[PDB]
């Protein structure tokens, strides 16, 4: 199936996903020399009091952190947003190597992670209804740089023992987002598509432009996960990244002076 592998990875996709060749796709290169300011913007709002996680997931892929979305608990509005986008899960992708790892670059620059907040319009009922349209998702997408550790990512590294492997997950009740998040909510924004098949262009990208800081020690756990199921050769959940596609006819707007 698809994956990051040698013989699977983001360059044969486009066999069974033809879109990943589309004009809409994820991520991108965000030049921060051409995208412009745009005043029509709103501060993003983040409401995640209510938030309540439930399970992580290792999905064989990367793992998911998923949250009750039958209620507006945890929402994304503002922005370039029109409504109210409901937070499903959040995942990472991440290097084998600290020098990569994310998905979006920022000048070419890679940074060794990426965490993706996922959030569908309420307006669609659920989510797999929501990927089937243009303003379907909002992802708000935070880099991740090695330095100091992330006090509020701990939780996760720490349940990553127990979902090694493709298909295990844990209960994981009580985890508070907020804690992955920068001081600075300024942002880049652009349409786009999810980066993993079936790559939908369904996507408002809001990436942030302030980097969290995770140890050297964080990063470590999280490549010691596995891709493979348990009781396989192993293969280390590494590199789980697609490259910057083309921009084609877009134009990537900053919140941001
Ligand atoms: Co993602």
């Given at each position: 199936?698809?994956?990051?592998?040698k013989?699977?990875?983001?360059?044969?996709?486009?066999?069974?996903?033809?879109?990943?060749?589309?004009?809409?796709?994820?991520?991108?290169?965000?030049?921060?020399?051409?995208?412009?300011?745009?005043?029509?913007?709103?501060?993003?709002?983040?409401?995640?009091?209510?938030?309540?996680?439930?399970?992580?997931l290792?999905?064989?892929?990367?793992?998911?952190?998923?949250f009750?979305?039958?209620?507006?608990?945890?929402?994304?509005?503002?922005?370039?947003?029109?409504?109210?986008y409901?937070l499903?899960?959040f995942?990472?992708?991440?290097?084998?190597?600290?020098?990569?790892?994310?998905?979006?670059?920022?000048?070419?620059?890679?940074?060794?992670?990426?965490?993706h907040l996922?959030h569908?319009?309420?307006?669609?009922?659920?989510?797999?209804?929501?990927?089937?349209?243009?303003?379907?998702?909002?992802?708000?997408?935070?880099?991740?740089?090695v330095?100091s550790?992330?006090?509020?990512?701990?939780?996760?590294?720490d349940?990553?023992?127990?979902?090694?492997?493709?298909?295990?997950?844990?209960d994981?009740?009580?985890?508070?987002?907020?804690?992955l998040l920068?001081?600075?909510?300024?942002?880049?924004?652009?349409?786009?598509?999810?980066?993993?098949?079936?790559?939908?262009?369904?996507?408002?990208?809001?990436?942030?432009?302030?980097?969290?800081?995770?140890?050297?020690?964080?990063?470590?756990?999280?490549?010691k996960?596995?891709?493979?199921?348990?009781?396989?050769?192993?293969?280390?959940m590494?590199?789980?990244?697609?490259?910057?596609q083309?921009?084609?006819?877009?134009?990537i707007?900053?919140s941001?002076?």
């Amino acid at each position: 199936h698809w994956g990051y592998g040698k013989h699977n990875g983001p360059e044969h996709w486009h066999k069974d996903f033809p879109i990943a060749k589309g004009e809409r796709q994820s991520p991108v290169d965000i030049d921060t020399h051409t995208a412009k300011y745009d005043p029509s913007l709103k501060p993003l709002s983040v409401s995640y009091d209510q938030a309540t996680s439930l399970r992580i997931l290792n999905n064989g892929h990367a793992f998911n952190v998923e949250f009750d979305d039958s209620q507006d608990k945890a929402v994304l509005k503002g922005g370039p947003l029109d409504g109210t986008y409901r937070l499903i899960q959040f995942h990472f992708h991440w290097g084998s190597l600290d020098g990569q790892g994310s998905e979006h670059t920022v000048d070419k620059k890679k940074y060794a992670a990426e965490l993706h907040l996922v959030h569908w319009n309420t307006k669609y009922g659920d989510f797999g209804k929501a990927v089937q349209q243009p303003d379907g998702l909002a992802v708000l997408g935070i880099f991740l740089k090695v330095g100091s550790a992330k006090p509020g990512l701990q939780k996760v590294v720490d349940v990553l023992d127990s979902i090694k492997t493709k298909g295990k997950s844990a209960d994981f009740t009580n985890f508070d987002p907020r804690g992955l998040l920068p001081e600075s909510l300024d942002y880049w924004t652009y349409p786009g598509s999810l980066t993993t098949p079936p790559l939908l262009e369904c996507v408002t990208w809001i990436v942030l432009k302030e980097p969290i800081s995770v140890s050297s020690e964080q990063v470590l756990k999280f490549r010691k996960l596995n891709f493979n199921g348990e009781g396989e050769p192993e293969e280390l959940m590494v590199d789980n990244w697609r490259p910057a596609q083309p921009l084609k006819n877009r134009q990537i707007k900053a919140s941001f002076k």
